[PDB]
Amino acid sequence: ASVHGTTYELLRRQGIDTVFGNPGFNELPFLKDFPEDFRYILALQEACVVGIADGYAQASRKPAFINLHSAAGTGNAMGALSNARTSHSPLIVTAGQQTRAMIGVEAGETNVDAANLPRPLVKWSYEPASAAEVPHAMSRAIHMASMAPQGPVYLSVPYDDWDKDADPQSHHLFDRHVSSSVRLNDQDLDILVKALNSASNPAIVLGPDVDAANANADCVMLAERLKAPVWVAPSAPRCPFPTRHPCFRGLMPAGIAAISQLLEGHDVVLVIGAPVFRYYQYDPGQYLKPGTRLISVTCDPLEAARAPMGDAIVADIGAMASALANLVEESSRQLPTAAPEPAKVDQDAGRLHPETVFDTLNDMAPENAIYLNESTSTTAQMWQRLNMRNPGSYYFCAAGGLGFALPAAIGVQLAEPERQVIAVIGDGSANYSISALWTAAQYNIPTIFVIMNNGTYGMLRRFAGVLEAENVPGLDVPGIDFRALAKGYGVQALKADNLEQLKGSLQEALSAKGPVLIEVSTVS
Ligand SMILES: Cc1ncc(C[n+]2csc(CCOP(=O)(O)OP(=O)(O)O)c2C)c(N)n1
Ligand SMILES: [Mg+2]
């Protein structure tokens, strides 16, 4: 058996059947003789390849396999990998290297010091010392990606390795199963349970790791039993709780003072699957007010170490959520009251307020719709106005890198064919990974793309204000025709210059057999 044959057998055996890629010289000996049980998903730029794999991985809650071309291909995907690091996305990033005999002279397409390139974004990076080590290197890649805390890994393979004889001993890798489904020991778990049972005014904060583990339901049961209000942690890359549930308090503001104020009065704050905290704006103050103690459950040692306050437990979010939900007592406390219904804003028959767009989407979209956000100035309004009852219903770039949602929406739609994906993307954001559209068209992945066209980098103008930053150049993006871009890449394009045009376009897009892009003329 060749290294080619053995690697594809290992991928097969580890449950991988999809290659997200953009091909190159160095990848031809990998991609040739492409097995019938695999599918190749081509994107036109490596940001878009990784974005699609990333969405695919997060929705399927399984590793996604990527093949890129050397330094240039790997480099083009670096922004995407930044998002993948923070989302703990299980991505196997493979890249072809020049033939072993030509690495020394640095022939064209040589990836120099290959393993250092993706650092520090990946959890593991590697170039095998020999062709016969490639399957073992791939096994390490798979498990390093899949073990908590999950994350992107990188493997560089000299193109001449694939044709070589594999080690017959490589067969022991095929069915390797590694488990990170661990929870705190009974003694320390009973202590934690007894502290939640005893809390006067408990508060729960959930991060993306809850949605990643599908711990949503256990957290709902946990919140019901403790009769406790629930927030999603700041800069939320995913939605870990039903947003119209009585306990839900919404998106936490990404500020130090703001969060301590919010938690004031809460004796015990339980944070699950979230960094403590992903602060964004400089909001100096106390991390916690007196009388509030914090306990953080995280699957990431880095997040436990980084926390400027509270106690931490490093464990599987799924296993811990299940354990806590089934062990805590029913509080005699009354269930928190559901948040108020959002206000309908004044809307004329002209350019649309973001609020109008989100109200419209909530009325018209299927109850199991999946949303992606890269409309950077409208995130707060989106969280308030979209009723997301089910797991895996929301995705935002984890590291805030733009160019995620458009590709990611295609990967989510591919993973969830029976759930309508609707990506709400700003006019600025749409450009970073615009070429991703071609993939939806070519593979007939029926993602709906809603472009919020305000002519500007809205969020930067708003932040310019907060920073008192005047005469900043490059904040406006006029003269972009998103329907012409969609047509450029074979995607049906509709326009919505007003509410009746929005209602029409959406009903059309919801009944379309293919991807549809709606260009929405939004205010400001
Ligand atoms: C790769 C990358 N480049 C730049 C930024 C900085 N950035 C943050 S928000 C933003 C503006 C996005 O504009 P748009 O999608 O039109 O949404 P709006 O702010 O108008 O709602 C930019 C450029 C980033 N986060 N990532
Ligand atoms: Mg904009």
Q: Strand pairing partners for 232?
A: 206, 251
Q: How far apart are CA 354 and CA 375, in angstroms?
A: 9
Which of 459, 461, 467, 476 has the most ligand 1 atoms within 8 A of CB, as the residue to mutate? 459
Q: Which residues lie across from 154 on neighbouring strands?
A: 93, 125
456 lines ligand 1 (CB under 6 A): yes
| Euclidean distance between CA atoms 168 and 101, whole angstroms | 24
3-state secondary structure of 422: strand
Residue 332 burial class via C-beta count within 10 angstroms: exposed 0-12, middle 13-18, buried 19 and up: exposed
Q: Which residues, including other chains, have CB under 8 Å from residue 478's CB and lie 6 or more apart?
A: 455
Ligand 1 in contact with 400 (CB < 6 A)?
A: yes
Burial class of 160 by CB neighbour count within 10 A (0 to 12, 13 to 18, 19+): middle
DSSP H or E stretch at residue 424: strand 421-426
Ligand 1 touching residue 408 (CB < 6 A): no
Three-state SS for 383?
Answer: helix
Residue owning the nearest CA to atom 21 of ligand 1: 377
- Domain 3-173 identical in fold to domain 354-521: yes
Instruction: Give the count of alpha carbons within 13 A of 213, CB side only.
Output: 31
End-to-end CA distance of the chain: 62
Q: Are 20 and 47 in contact (CB under 8 A)?
A: no
427 is in an annotated binding site: yes
Helix/strand/coil percentages in the chain, nearest 5: 40, 20, 40
Ligand 1 mutation target, pool 45, 377, 475, 482, most atoms within 8 A of CB: 377
- In angstroms, the CA 47 to CA 78 distance is 7
Exposed / middle / buried, residue 33 (Cβ in 10 Å: 0-12, 13-18, 19+) = exposed
What are the Cα distances from residue 19, in Å, to 27, 45, 307, 336, 346?
12, 15, 37, 46, 47
Calpha distance 222→192 (Å, rounded)? 13
Single out the residue of 215, 195, 197 nearest to residue 206, CA to CA.
215
Find out whether 249 is annotated in a ligand binding site.
no
How close is the Cα of 208 to the center of ligand 1, in Å? 21
Strand (E) or helix (H) holding 41 = strand 39-42
Q: Which protein residue's CA is at the shortest distance from atom 3 of ligand 1?
A: 402
To the question of whether residue 385 is assigned a binding role by annotation, the answer is: no
Q: In this structure, are residues 317 and 297 in contact, taking their beta carbons and an 8 Å threshold?
A: yes
- The experimental technique used to determine this model is X-ray
**Distance separating alpha carbons of residues 53 and 66, to the nearest angstrom:** 7
Asked whether 87 lines ligand 1 (CB < 6 A), one says no
CA distance 454 to 316: 42
Residue 119 assigned as binding residue? yes
The CATH number that domain 3-173 falls under is: 3.40.50.970
Ligand 1: which of 378, 402, 452, 477 to mutate, most ligand atoms within 8 Å of CB? 402
How much distance in Å is there from the Cα of 438 to the middle of ligand 2? 22
Domain ranges of the chain: 3-173, 186-327, 354-521
**Domain 354-521 class in CATH:** alpha beta
> Which residue type does 275 have?
P
* DSSP for 449-518, written as a single string: EEEEE-SB-HHHHHHHHHTT--S-SS-B-----HHHHHHHTT-EEEEESSHHHHHHHHHHHHH-SS-EEE
Cα distances from 516 to residues 486, 507, 512, in angstroms, run 8, 11, 7
Minimum CA distance residue for ligand 1 atom 18: 458
Q: What φ, ψ does residue 357 adopt, rounded to 5°?
A: -55, -45
Evaluate: CB of 427 within 6 angstroms of ligand 1. Answer: yes
CATH architecture under which domain 186-327 falls = 3-Layer(aba) Sandwich (3.40)
Q: Answer for the pair 395, 84: CB distance below 8 angstroms, yes or no.
A: no
Helix (H) or strand (E) holding 194: helix 186-198
Contact 354 CB / ligand 1 (< 6 Å): no
Tell which residue, 249, 469, 267, has the closest CA to residue 339: 249
Distance 464 CA to ligand 1 centre (A): 13
